[PDB]
Design a protein around this ligand. Structure first.
Ligand SMILES: COC(=O)C[C@](O)(CCCC(C)(C)O)C(=O)O[C@@H]1C(OC)=C[C@]23CCCN2CCc2cc4c(cc2[C@H]13)OCO4
Ligand SMILES: [Mg+2]
Ligand SMILES: [Mg+2]
Ligand SMILES: [Mg+2]
Ligand SMILES: [Mg+2]
Ligand SMILES: [Mg+2]
Ligand SMILES: [Mg+2]
Ligand SMILES: [Mg+2]
Ligand SMILES: [Mg+2]
Ligand SMILES: [Mg+2]
Ligand SMILES: [Mg+2]
Ligand SMILES: [Mg+2]
Ligand SMILES: [Mg+2]
Ligand SMILES: [Mg+2]
Ligand SMILES: [Mg+2]
Ligand SMILES: [Mg+2]
Ligand SMILES: [Mg+2]
Ligand SMILES: [Mg+2]
Ligand SMILES: [Mg+2]
Ligand SMILES: [Mg+2]
Ligand SMILES: [Mg+2]
Ligand SMILES: [Mg+2]
Ligand SMILES: [Mg+2]
Ligand SMILES: [Mg+2]
Ligand SMILES: [Mg+2]
Ligand SMILES: [Mg+2]
Ligand SMILES: [Mg+2]
Ligand SMILES: [Mg+2]
Ligand SMILES: [Mg+2]
Ligand SMILES: [Mg+2]
Ligand SMILES: [Mg+2]
Ligand SMILES: [Mg+2]
Ligand SMILES: [Mg+2]
Ligand SMILES: [Mg+2]
Ligand SMILES: [Mg+2]
Ligand SMILES: [Mg+2]
Ligand SMILES: [Mg+2]
Lengths: 139, 201, 109, 190, 175, 252
RNA sequence: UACCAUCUGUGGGAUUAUGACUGAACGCCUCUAAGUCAGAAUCCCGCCCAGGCGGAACGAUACGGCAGCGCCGCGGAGCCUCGGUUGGCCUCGGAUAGCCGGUCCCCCGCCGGGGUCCGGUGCGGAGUGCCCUUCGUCCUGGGAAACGGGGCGCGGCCGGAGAGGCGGCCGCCCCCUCGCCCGUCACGCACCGCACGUUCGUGGGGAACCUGGCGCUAAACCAUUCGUAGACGACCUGCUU
RNA sequence: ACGUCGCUUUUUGAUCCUUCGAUGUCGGCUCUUCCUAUCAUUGUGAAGCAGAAUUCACCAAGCGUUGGAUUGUUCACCCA
RNA sequence: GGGCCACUUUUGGUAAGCAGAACUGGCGCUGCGGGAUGAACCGAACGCCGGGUUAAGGCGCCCGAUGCCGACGCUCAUCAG
């Protein structure tokens, strides 16, 4: 229990608001509800954001609290988050959910043909893995 | 969309679910509320028990055969909360109220179906966890309902059959994770088309 | 083949609390539940198809028992989807909670 | 004002070895085992060490009324540890004036019969909570001696046989009769 | 007086020059208001209580917004205010954490209405200044004065309760 | 304003709708709680009232006024010929109540038992249970009864015994018997249903069901009096003699 | 017909006041804050009385010579009437200060069950999902298929009772190499911009008509009796051996 | 005690709002129901509670609260 | 040529939905939207209609409208509000 904490340098993911879909770093904690929040490499200027808009990630940047923008930027680039992110599964599920919304009517036909074929080969061997795997003749 | 909406009543708040149901009822939408044993009511037990005991005291003294009908089974307690949220003195609200079928537990029309959940009415979402809550199945028992003991023995044996169906549904699901490992060189074209267009992460 | 119309529900007339205006309908369309989601339907054509006893003339076929009141969508009513519609003859009150076909006519796509 | 963090560790001896099934502490000592579900208080529990085996409990943004339950869960665990390393011995003493009180021990120590209370002919038969070994001593003249591992069950069983022997419709300043809890001890003085 | 997000105005005024004093002295105040219309009408509220000055015998010399000098560092604002209750009137001192001066005064009005049912016409803020962390006194402000602040978000309550309204799976609160 | 003189209410409110009974036998409405530890037995019987008598016995109440002294008790006599087990019925317990699951009547049902199934025996053709008696003497009608006597074993919790009286042994004018369900307590469901076909077509006497010197409950229908006024029906105080429109009324 | 004679009159549960237990807040104390205990002519239910425009199980179901009825047929010919609807989801229990999924040693007739380990967790083994996917046939090739599909083919068996009105499995058949993807090859009313089209559906309901096959041959009420009943109705009874 | 804050509508006033092309008017008898501000009974706390008796409170309206002399009496008063 | 009500001022009265004055507006003579309901309160006064937008008041369901990922707090009531 409790592994993803709010602290100085916690990389947060913004879920809604004007900066929805941006990674961002937590700089300081403004009184239980708001946080001084700065994303130097994801185009998000330093401002106050509530903790309900943001969602905590696994990555933690090391820098002292209330530091200037150029020190949270060269801490973003050391152990570079933008290649760590867009390699994790939660970053991949975001891009593989918006490109399902970026799916034209002709792309949706081509998935309709490729899925209907792929559910014939998979449906075939799950019969062969349950009528040959039931071959048991032992007491 | 003219199928029936089936709602597992366990873990829901009484009037938060009733207001959701009584508006879907007015929009067509035959809805079936199963398992009323587990509907919660906010506030502690004794407080909520006193509300129902105070209702039992409302009674036409001239002839209580004509007065308020104090239904005691949980399903009919929930049926009355949505009654007061419908215009049941009109034919629009009586044809509405016929679309709702309420049951205690889960009868065998609906035991072999998937139940929907209303997150706007759940106890874990709409109450702070440092609060108290009463069970509608328990405050019916100490109020006059006869059948929580036969309902408990019929919901235990339904969950016996639910584990058996699940462990067969879960056994086929680990066969598809074996089949897709074997026949994968012959679906490399088809698994790349779906991976391109937002599916198959 | 294909449904080709999106399905809506006749919820009520345009009303206050103690007055109603039967010339404007209120529709609930499935899938759209926000005001910033309903500008697609903002001018589309809509219809109430019903069956009766007597045969009536049909455009493109022999007489059947289906009659249609035609209308269109004017604008949105509230924040949670809920367009308001305007039909030619005002909707009968028996149609509350019944199917209204939103028909994808005149298109902007 | 809600305090961001309030912790309180609990030391654990070597003869016990406890586990955590979420909010469920299972203490296992040389005298048996105990188990209480704590799923009504929102705290997190944690075994920390591997040689001294601390037990921390956090609270994380509780107000004044939620913050009170951090030290109680510590006190419930420390009564489980003393329950299975030492136990709970309640020596309790019968105080009579004219009529001596007969206490006979029924089946395996789980039932007492209090007969001659103020010279009345009613027989008081109060059942022990399961796991309490109520007996009659031998070094004193008339006092009950009830064993056990759970302090909410030993002291409840001691309170069943104290609420039963109450004097009714009389003065309670005189008529000091009854069986009263004399001293709350432990077995095996550490 | 209403609210909604308060600005800060430097309002400067003086008495109209009669043949008694040819140049009457300039006075300035700091005023937290929704806009400069209210800021010029709250100026003649206090300067009529401090000095014998009315609006007809006076003029607004300079009215204008005071912007925050450092809106990107977290500051401790100690606010000396003065309100009246259902009983008599009282003096107070409250402490807040905010990025702007006028944001901590907006935060004071919502907290004096929450805790004391004090409407905004009752409240008179008289002093507001940046307190350091070693001179704060209130414990709710001082608990955030740690270089190693670390806390989770324990019980995440679902906000999208209606998208979808009917789902098949029960939500998660552990994140 | 108040009355000024307290007086209890005339009559119970707990016995009323005071209508004519909707039956003539006497519905049981509650059988004794059943527990499997007991041997297998019946819980009710059915007999006719014959008349009263007084007896003389002596009393053993140690400490009483009439210990070892002879008193005159008033008794009644109930003629109880043996009841014939004619069928069996099992109930399944539901969250809506207790519905009836399956009943299996026997072969060789007597004419006094089939008399009950007709409102007019003179003009009828006696055809009751003439299609149903042939599935006791069949091959592919047989084993559906051992599917009826096996689903009622594994799904029912309460089984009963349909029994009738035998009017041919009584001095009454009526030859139509009285059928009655009498449940079988004491034992598991697989034993009590095996027990209740051993007795099927056989008689059970009152000596088996009820023993010596035990207390029972008597269920029946009161002697009927007709349409009566408030002074007979409710035993209210009569009104003084110089009352104009009626003495035997309720005033207010 | 009478306390003016005689007989009968009942068991739980949650708890109120109140007394407590463990126990903090307030590193002591405390019945209280979380968590517990005892608890009453009260309350609620049982026992008892009635039995819903509320259900159930079962019985029998209309003839002696023209007369009906039920079941099994897509078995037909068409009339009328009431309307709705426009693909399915066939199901773990649940936790929420935590969960879901795989797994080594161990044990309750080889399922289950446990403590290590391995992954997932803004749920992707995902309802923000999944499964189906509807132009038609003909030419013709390559792949998936060969452990295939199809039929109201009949028999055979098993599972489902809480409202089962259902869901699988089978032995002998029957034709079929088509139906699923990527292609070749062309044609069909292409009805000349335009609406109610596309379904469930061989729908529910009331009729009557033709043509097969298979079974069945009743009751209720009145009248008359009775008097365990009764103002009248109703109710309880009897009526060729 | 001096003061002071309330409730109630089982007292009597105050008012004139309804009713003068009419709402039958004191008491009793009778009969049902309700209220609690509890006299008794069940469970408790307090005492200037040794017992017995009584007193003050608490949950509580389940259940009971009579027979008479005088008076038209409601009230009142005695007998038991 | 019987009036009545409401803000503020005011007389008698313990008080009154009591009796009597001053000022303005209202009801009576007048419907409509809101106050659930109501002569007077709040908004606004009315020929018959279509479109738009507001007032006072609202926007879980009845019942039109927050199905906003509204902001910050306070509050547990065994007669809450
Ligand atoms: C002196 O007063 C009388 O005589 C009473 C009577 O005359 C009774 C009328 C009975 C008749 C004569 C109609 O049989 C009458 O007209 O009463 C009025 C009467 O007649 C029914 C009704 C009144 C006025 C309206 C209601 N009120 C009720 C009874 C009543 C009682 C009175 C009373 C007047 C009323 C009147 O004065 C004091 O006690
Ligand atoms: Mg149709
Ligand atoms: Mg037509
Ligand atoms: Mg302690
Ligand atoms: Mg005494
Ligand atoms: Mg500045
Ligand atoms: Mg939805
Ligand atoms: Mg009276
Ligand atoms: Mg009285
Ligand atoms: Mg006379
Ligand atoms: Mg008598
Ligand atoms: Mg009890
Ligand atoms: Mg203590
Ligand atoms: Mg207590
Ligand atoms: Mg208890
Ligand atoms: Mg009842
Ligand atoms: Mg892990
Ligand atoms: Mg008068
Ligand atoms: Mg009059
Ligand atoms: Mg009258
Ligand atoms: Mg009259
Ligand atoms: Mg009281
Ligand atoms: Mg006392
Ligand atoms: Mg009473
Ligand atoms: Mg006299
Ligand atoms: Mg006049
Ligand atoms: Mg005049
Ligand atoms: Mg006046
Ligand atoms: Mg007047
Ligand atoms: Mg005018
Ligand atoms: Mg007006
Ligand atoms: Mg109005
Ligand atoms: Mg009001
Ligand atoms: Mg005004
Ligand atoms: Mg208009
Ligand atoms: Mg409203
Ligand atoms: Mg609405």
């Amino acid at each position: 229990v409790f592994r993803r904490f709010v602290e100085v340098g916690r990389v947060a993911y913004v879920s809604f608001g004007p900066h929805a879909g941006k990674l961002v770093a937590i700089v300081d904690v403004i009184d239980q509800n708001r946080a001084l929040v700065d994303g130097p490499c994801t185009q998000v200027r330093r401002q106050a954001m509530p903790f309900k808009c943001m969602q905590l990630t696994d990555f933690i940047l090391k820098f002292p609290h209330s530091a200037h923008q150029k020190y949270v930027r060269q801490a973003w680039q050391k152990a570079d988050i933008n290649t760590k992110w867009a390699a994790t599964r939660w970053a991949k599920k975001i891009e593989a959910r918006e490109r399902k919304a970026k799916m034209t009517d002709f792309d949706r036909f081509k998935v309709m043909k490729a899925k209907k074929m792929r559910n014939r080969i998979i449906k075939n061997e799950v019969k062969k893995l349950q009528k040959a795997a039931l071959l048991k003749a032992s007491p | 969309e003219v199928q029936v909406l089936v709602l597992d009543g366990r873990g829901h708040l009484l009037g938060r679910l009733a207001a959701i149901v009584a508006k879907q009822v007015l929009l067509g939408r035959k809805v079936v509320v199963v398992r009323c044993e587990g509907i919660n009511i906010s506030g502690n037990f004794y407080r909520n028990k006193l509300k129902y005991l105070a209702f039992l005291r409302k009674r036409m003294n001239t002839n209580p055969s004509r007065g308020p009908y104090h239904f005691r089974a949980p399903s009919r307690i929930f049926w009355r909360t949505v009654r007061g949220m419908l215009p049941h003195k009109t034919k629009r609200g009586q044809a509405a109220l016929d679309r709702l079928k309420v049951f205690d537990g889960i009868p065998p029309p609906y035991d072999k179906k998937k139940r929907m959940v209303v997150p706007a009415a759940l106890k874990v979402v709409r109450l702070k966890p440092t609060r108290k809550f009463a069970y509608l199945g328990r405050l019916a028992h100490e109020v006059g309902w006869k059948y929580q003991a036969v309902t408990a023995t019929l919901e235990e044996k339904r969950k016996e059959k639910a584990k058996i169906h699940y462990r067969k549904k879960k056994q086929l699901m680990r066969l598809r994770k074996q089949a897709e490992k074997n026949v994968e060189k012959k679906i490399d074209k088809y698994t790349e088309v779906l991976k391109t267009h937002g599916l198959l992460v | 083949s294909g449904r080709l119309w999106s399905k809506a529900i006749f919820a009520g007339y345009k009303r206050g609390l103690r007055n109603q205006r039967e010339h404007t309908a209120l529709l609930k369309i499935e899938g759209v539940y926000a005001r910033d989601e309903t500008e697609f339907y903002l001018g589309k054509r809509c219809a109430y198809v019903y069956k009766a006893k007597n045969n009536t003339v049909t455009p493109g076929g022999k007489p059947n028992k289906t009659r249609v009141i035609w209308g269109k969508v004017t604008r949105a009513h509230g924040n949670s989807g809920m367009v308001r519609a305007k039909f030619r003859s005002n909707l009968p009150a028996k149609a509350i909670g019944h199917r209204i076909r939103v028909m994808l006519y005149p298109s902007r796509i | 004002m809600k305090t961001i963090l309030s912790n309180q560790t609990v030391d654990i001896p070597e003869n016990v070895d406890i586990t955590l099934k979420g909010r469920t502490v299972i203490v296992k000592g040389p005298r048996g085992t105990l188990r209480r579900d704590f799923n009504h208080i929102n705290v997190e529990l944690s075994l920390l060490g591997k040689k001294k085996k601390r037990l921390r409990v956090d609270k994380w943004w509780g107000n004044r009324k939620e913050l009170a339950t951090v030290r109680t869960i510590c006190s419930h665990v420390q009564n489980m540890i003393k329950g299975v390393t030492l136990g709970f011995r309640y020596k309790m003493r019968s105080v009579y004036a004219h009529f001596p009180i007969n206490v006979v021990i029924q089946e395996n120590g789980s039932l007492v019969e209090i007969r001659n209370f103020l010279g009345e002919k009613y027989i008081r038969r109060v059942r022990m909570r399961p796991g309490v070994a109520c007996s009659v001593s031998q070094a004193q003249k008339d006092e009950l001696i009830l064993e056990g591992n759970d302090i909410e069950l030993v002291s409840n069983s001691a309170a069943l046989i104290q609420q039963a022997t109450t004097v009714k419709n009389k003065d309670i300043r005189k008529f000091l009769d009854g069986i009263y809890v004399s001293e709350k001890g432990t077995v095996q003085q550490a | 007086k209403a609210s909604g997000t308060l600005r800060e105005y430097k309002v400067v005024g003086r008495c109209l020059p009669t043949p008694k004093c040819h140049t009457p002295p300039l006075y300035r105040m700091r005023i937290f208001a929704p806009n400069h219309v209210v800021a010029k009408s709250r100026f003649w509220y206090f300067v009529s209580q401090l000095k014998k000055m009315k609006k007809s015998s006076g003029e607004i010399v300079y009215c204008g917004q005071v912007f925050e000098k450092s809106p990107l560092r977290v500051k401790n604002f100690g606010i000396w205010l003065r309100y009246d209750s259902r009983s008599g009137t009282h003096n107070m001192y409250r402490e807040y954490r905010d990025l702007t001066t006028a944001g901590a005064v907006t935060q004071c009005y919502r907290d004096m209405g929450a805790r004391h049912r004090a409407r905004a016409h009752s409240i008179q803020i008289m002093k507001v200044e940046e307190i350091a962390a070693s001179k704060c006194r209130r414990p709710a402000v001082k608990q955030f004065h740690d270089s190693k602040i670390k806390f989770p978000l324990p019980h995440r309550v679902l906000r999208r309760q209606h998208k979808p309204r009917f789902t098949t799976k029960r939500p998660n609160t552990f994140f | 304003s108040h009355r000024k003189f307290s007086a209890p209410r005339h009559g119970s409110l707990g016995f009323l709708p005071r209508k004519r009974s909707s039956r003539h036998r006497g519905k049981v409405k509650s059988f004794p709680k059943d527990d499997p530890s007991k041997p297998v037995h019946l819980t009710a019987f059915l007999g006719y009232k014959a008349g009263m008598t007084h007896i003389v016995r002596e009393v053993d109440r140690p400490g009483s006024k009439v210990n070892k002294k002879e008193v005159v008790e008033a008794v009644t006599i109930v003629e109880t010929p043996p009841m014939v087990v004619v069928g069996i019925v099992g109930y399944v317990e539901t969250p809506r109540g207790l519905r009836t699951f399956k009943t299996v009547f026997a072969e060789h049902i007597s004419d006094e038992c089939k008399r009950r199934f007709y409102k007019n025996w003179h003009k009828s053709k006696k055809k009751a249970f003439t299609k149903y008696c042939k599935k006791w003497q069949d091959e592919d009608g047989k084993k559906q009864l051992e599917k009826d006597f096996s689903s009622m074993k594994k799904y029912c919790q309460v089984i009963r015994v349909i029994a009738h009286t035998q009017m041919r042994l009584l001095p009454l004018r009526q030859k139509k018997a009285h059928l009655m369900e009498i449940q079988v307590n004491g034992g598991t469901v697989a034993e009590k249903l095996d027990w209740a076909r051993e007795r099927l077509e056989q008689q059970v006497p009152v000596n088996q069901v009820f023993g010596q010197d035990e207390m029972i409950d008597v269920i029946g229908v009161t002697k009927g009096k007709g349409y009566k006024g408030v002074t007979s029906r409710w035993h209210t105080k009569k009104l003084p003699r110089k009352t104009h429109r009626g003495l035997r009324k309720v005033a207010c």
